[PDB]
Design a protein around this ligand. Structure first.
Ligand SMILES: CC[C@H](O)[C@@H]1N(S(C)(=O)=O)[C@H]2CC[C@]1(O)CC2
Ligand SMILES: CC[C@H](O)[C@@H]1N(S(C)(=O)=O)[C@H]2CC[C@]1(O)CC2
Length: 284
């Protein structure tokens, strides 16, 4: 079926939970043996969210190459994404090592450091220009260059220096600051505006390594971001945009990381975002 009318048909019939459970039943199951080794327990935020072995990002280190991060490679859309958990106190150096080694331009953050009165990820970037951060375990230096605070999101320019080689690179930090502590946003308008700002920066384009996107577990909000982006790109590329099947795209993405889209409300919100986004592209 088309998307917008399949949407109203699920709303009128109130069957979002049944649709979402079907997706959960059909989703891929691949091994995640490296994630479950005892030496990696303090590298995982949640015991039930792990990267598959076949798609995990490897650190370029001979001691321990493990990080909780997955490469999502979308062949028809010609887009790749790295989805990862919010960094932990003992993985902030690994996080920036990955950004460096994978040649990423942008980092997309969809959570606040504290939500619901609890810590959802480490404070992993510097908050003042004159107070830079040094990660001694991976030999990297990180400096805040500029910050632009808007009503729904903040964009930061950061300098990452590899202290071994003295090479430097500019990294863009895109921080969506207004996702509610409970539920999903009422309108997708600010989320779409944010997606378009990431796109306009070059961070999603083939001349760079894959964008790094995270929330707390790296599957819920993060899944919504890449699902919406890929669906909109496919609608632009194909002769028949009504042929894009958001459930099929989601199942393709779940070949590369488990659990993408965590609730039926996140599934409905993803439909809403793609539907509204397709009207603005036209092109309007
Ligand atoms: C009551 C929670 C359900 O998951 C609701 N469904 S439901 C029953 O299928 O209509 C959708 C999405 C989330 C929701 O609260 C609002 C409409
Ligand atoms: C080619 C990877 C580098 O050798 C990494 N650095 S780095 C970024 O150049 O400082 C140190 C040593 C080993 C390493 O993988 C992790 C920390």
């Amino acid at each position: 079926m088309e998307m917008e009318k399949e949407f109203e048909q699920i709303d009128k019939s109130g069957s979002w939970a049944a649709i979402y459970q079907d997706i959960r039943h059909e989703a891929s199951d691949f091994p995640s043996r490296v994630a479950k080794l005892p030496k990696n327990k303090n590298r995982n935020r949640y015991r039930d969210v792990s990267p598959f072995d076949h798609s995990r990002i490897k650190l370029h280190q001979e001691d321990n190459d493990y990080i909780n991060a997955s490469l999502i490679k979308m062949e028809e859309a010609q887009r790749s994404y790295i989805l990862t958990q919010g960094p932990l106190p003992n993985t902030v150096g690994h996080f920036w090592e990955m950004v460096w080694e994978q040649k990423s331009r942008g980092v997309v953050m969809l959570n606040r450091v504290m939500e619901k009165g609890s810590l959802k990820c480490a404070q992993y970037w510097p908050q003042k220009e004159e107070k830079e951060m040094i990660f001694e375990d991976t030999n990297l230096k990180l400096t805040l260059i500029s910050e632009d605070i808007k009503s729904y999101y903040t964009v930061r320019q950061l300098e990452l220096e590899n202290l071994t080689t003295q090479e430097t690179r500019e990294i863009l930090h895109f921080h969506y600051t207004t996702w509610p502590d409970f539920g999903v946003p009422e309108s997708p308008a600010s989320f779409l505006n944010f997606l378009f700002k990431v796109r306009e920066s070059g961070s999603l384009s083939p001349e760079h390594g894959p964008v790094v996107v995270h929330c707390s577990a790296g599957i819920g909000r993060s899944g919504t971001f890449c699902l919406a982006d890929t669906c909109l790109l496919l609608m632009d590329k194909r002769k028949d945009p009504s042929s894009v099947d958001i459930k099929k795209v989601l199942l393709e993405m779940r070949k590369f990381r488990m659990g993408l889209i965590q609730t039926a409300d996140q599934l409905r919100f993803s439909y809403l975002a793609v539907i509204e986004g397709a009207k603005f592209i036209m092109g309007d």
